[PDB]
Design a protein around this ligand. Structure first.
Ligand SMILES: Cc1ncc(COP(=O)(O)O)c(CN)c1O
Ligand SMILES: Cc1ncc(COP(=O)(O)O)c(CN)c1O
Lengths: 427, 427
């Protein structure tokens, strides 16, 4: 297994960019170090600059649900770019994607496109406060909503993997506006409202968690949050940047039947290009400029290429058997992983919903960030590198959910379980 | 002049998105509210959904410096997308663009790519505070640096062309560590330091303003800021999202010979795709994760398509005579505009530097946002519509700088002045 080319490029990168990466998680610091440099991706695979091929379960962190470089998406982009990549003015494509999102997501009646999940989360945070007139927000430990200042509190994703404290650079005054509580803990949420009567703008969370490992909400958790937010006239906000269009066409809110007041979208809606969006009840979205006083702008927002990619991706997701297929192969993958762990004598737990899964090296069960942190990180680090060597590319962190795509074949799953057997038998 | 198709699409849009746009400035609110819907853009032109052709002086707000849909850029993207649009892992292209940016910009020794100017500004703001350990930031009235909550206080850009406030939702407290002063007012800046000893992380500004109309720094202004920030061990941050690679290959810091500690980039570096970046002195950039504790991430950051477009755009800008050409046509355009205004009896002032200009309906001169606000907005609104009717597309706001590109021919400039004469003669 050669990684000479990757080591070379990464070494040079560290002298040009912080940590030699554009995003912290790509770091490999908790997986051993030695990230692999990608050259190209297609369908369910990724190829190294060293020539190594991998069955990819990261899907560029969610966007590639239809498989990498889907021919229809590529074709749509090639035709579209001939008309220019950015206008800086309205175009018909924005209307089309807007309508598609509105029809797809239950809580969304009006939507505003942005360029990332971070921007969408920044905006929704600002809108929640402007609409309610309250400054406090409730978020859960282990959840991640982009790097906006107020979100850098008990955050997951790269924050968790790197084991850093609430990030510095954010003033004390702003941080005081973020109340945290353990995921799946309704009682802790009620206490926060009781201790801050009339100050909570609302509750934001990943309806299904992917940033502190894969975590599904307990029975009644989402329902409870909906109930109490309504009780105190606070907003319930679903960050479906990862779950949107992956858990179901309408995301978690649709599958689990709980309608929030606002939801953030990203990843999949961009089809592989930078795209984010936030929407919800019409009367709340009315506050967004230029319709309302809440100024939020974006030069590249709604650019024709991004809209094109998003539109084609959603159209492909509307075809027959899409989500059934995702659940079929992912359930077999997840079940197989757990069966193998047990057979090879390693404590483990996990689960999956549609094309989203998780696998932790701990007996669990895992209901929150604390439980997930019981995972044997050193064993995970060995497992990950071993899988890499067997041709399987997993997220380089125990605290990141894995993803499958429509391009993953039954054969790909077979090969992945075979690799898992080989690696875990040697762990 | 028919705009039937535009009115139709825009009317439908207002029922799907806030104000029917993805960004405030696009609703034409300060200029009558009848925006034109774009279908395509090429070279120095834009085409309506109604079939109308315009000589474009917005250039999608800065990115299109080499002309719209430049054939070499399109070709580079078509070749690149065959390998996938997003990896979610390191790629050789990031190193190439990183090196190019480092070599091009004086203050940048290390750089981190993001997906918009807003993300870059959010990050640099956090970095300034994390590095110095101070929470207060000084910004100028009329300047704009994204919608980073901690910034909605004297914000510029659209904030002027739509009677915007401190964009609600941003706790009056979050924006409590942000101090403002008039642009070009060194005395006001010294006073702020004196009134907040040891609390100022630094000073951030557009080295040349484009968001409160076009405004150049007075003699000694940039130099003074550098001097005083050094005096109080504070950072000097240049927001060159607009000016970067437009005012000069090395931006304003290079052309005017003043080196900041940090600078944000955007627009042009993306070649039309969503791209942003922040960099500066190596020791400061060292704090960015995963190299340091300051957290900042982005799923689409450093994606292949974005890097590809940025690389090709900067390569085109390194060809012989690029900036000389921009200055040549833009000086004639700007001078012509002023000459015509005088000949037609209308008080005006403006100016240009490279391919960036401004034209205000006020005698001026304009040294800051206050002066710019003396512009006759009603006259500007009539001028803009009249120009539209003559086939000229200008920024739909008196407080937005205009831009030219390498694709604008001498003939395009001639036709633009001819149009200006016709419109102003009838004003
Ligand atoms: C749930 C969630 N929300 C928001 C974000 C931020 O996304 P982006 O990189 O698009 O800013 C992330 C990280 N992808 C996320 O996992
Ligand atoms: C000087 C400046 N800084 C930051 C930004 C934010 O740019 P973006 O839309 O790319 O976030 C802009 C664009 N208005 C800008 O002109």
């Amino acid at each position: 297994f050669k990684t000479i080319k990757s080591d070379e490029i990464f070494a040079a990168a560290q002298k040009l960019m912080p940590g030699g990466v554009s995003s912290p998680v790509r770091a490999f610091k908790s997986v051993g170090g030695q990230p692999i440099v990608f050259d190209r991706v297609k369908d369910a695979y990724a190829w190294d600059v060293d020539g190594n091929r991998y069955i990819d379960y990261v899907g560029t962190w969610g966007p590639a649900i239809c498989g990498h470089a889907h021919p229809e998406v590529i074709e749509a982009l090639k035709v579209a770019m001939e008309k220019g990549t950015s206008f800086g003015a309205p175009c018909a494509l924005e209307n089309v994607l807007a309508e598609m999102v509105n029809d797809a997501v239950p809580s969304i009646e009006m939507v505003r496109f942005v360029n990332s999940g971070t921007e969408a989360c920044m905006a929704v945070l600002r809108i929640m406060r402007a609409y309610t007139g309250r400054d406090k927000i409730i978020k859960f430990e282990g959840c991640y909503h982009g790097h906006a200042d107020m979100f850098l509190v008990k955050a997951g994703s790269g924050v968790a993997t790197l084991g850093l404290p609430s990030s510095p650079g954010v003033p004390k005054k702003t941080t005081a506006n973020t109340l945290t509580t353990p995921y799946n803990d309704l009682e802790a949420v009620k206490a926060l409202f009781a201790e801050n009567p009339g100050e909570i703008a609302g509750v934001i969370l990943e309806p299904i968690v992917g940033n502190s490992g894969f975590i599904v909400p307990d029975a009644g958790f989402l329902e409870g949050l909906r109930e109490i937010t309504l009780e105190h006239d606070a907003l319930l906000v679903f960050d479906e940047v990862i779950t949107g269009f992956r858990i179901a066409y309408g995301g978690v809110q649709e599958k689990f039947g709980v309608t929030p007041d606002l939801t953030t979208l990203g990843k999949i809606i961009g089809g592989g290009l930078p795209v984010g969006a936030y929407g919800g009840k019409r009367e709340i979205m009315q506050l967004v400029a230029p319709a309302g006083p809440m100024y939020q702008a974006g030069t590249l927002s709604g650019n024709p290429l991004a809209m094109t990619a998003g539109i084609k991706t959603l159209e492909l997701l509307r075809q027959p058997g899409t989500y059934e297929y995702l659940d079929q192969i992912t359930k077999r993958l997840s079940d197989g992983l757990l069966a193998i762990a047990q057979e090879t004598g390693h404590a483990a737990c996990g689960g999956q919903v549609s094309g989203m899964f998780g696998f932790f090296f701990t007996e669990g069960p895992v209901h929150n960030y604390e439980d997930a942190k019981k995972s044997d990180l050193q064993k995970f680090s060995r497992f990950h590198r071993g899988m890499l060597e067997q041709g399987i590319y997993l997220a380089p962190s125990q605290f990141e959910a894995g993803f499958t795509s429509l391009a993953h074949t039954e054969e790909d799953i077979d090969a992945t379980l075979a690799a898992a057997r080989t690696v875990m038998s040697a762990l």
